[PDB]
Amino acid sequence: AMAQIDLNITCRFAGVFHVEKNGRYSISRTEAADLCKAFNSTLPTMAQMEKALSIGFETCRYGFIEGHVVIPRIHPNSICAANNTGVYILTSNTSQYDTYCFNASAPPEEDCTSVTDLPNAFDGPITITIVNRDGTRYVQKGEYRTNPEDIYPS
């Protein structure tokens, strides 16, 4: 396994945020749940994603929620789910995407407070870098993956 992981995280909108690993689609469904857990968060429900959308949350990236892979869209864009709007649900045959997460402690509105760590990561050997939208970035040593197939695929 690679000894470093980079995580780019968005601001939180009604608790919901987007996390992308390593600048490309690289998170499996099991990894997604674990990553959210390491942020003391959970995979958003569809209803939570609808609430975030209603206050301005959108991305141009597919990512896991509870039971689906989705992309939240407010403004139509020809290269983000083909000008569709809403919480767009994808069915394909591939496995890896980004993830969304929901934090119950976040405020109702948009919160761009710097995320300085993965508070619920555990001991391990990986240098994990968090990169916030404002460019503030932080490193820690640990692990968040609990599924050996995500770390050491057979």
Q: How many CB atoms lie within 10 A of CB 149?
A: 11
Going by the annotation, the residues of the binding site are 24, 61-62, 88
For residue 54, give the 3-state DSSP assignment: helix
Largest separation between any pair of C-alpha atoms in the chain: 43
Specify the resolution in Å.
1.6
* Residue ranges per structural domain of the chain: 1-151
Pairing of strands 12-13, 4-9: unpaired
Going by the annotation, the residues of the binding site for hyaluronan are 24, 61-62, 88
Residues 6+ apart with CB under 8 A from 28: 95, 96, 147, 150
Selection from 3, 2, 11, 32 nearest residue 131 by Cα: 11
Q: How many CB atoms lie within 10 A of CB 37?
A: 17
Q: Which residue has the tokens 């993830």?
A: 99
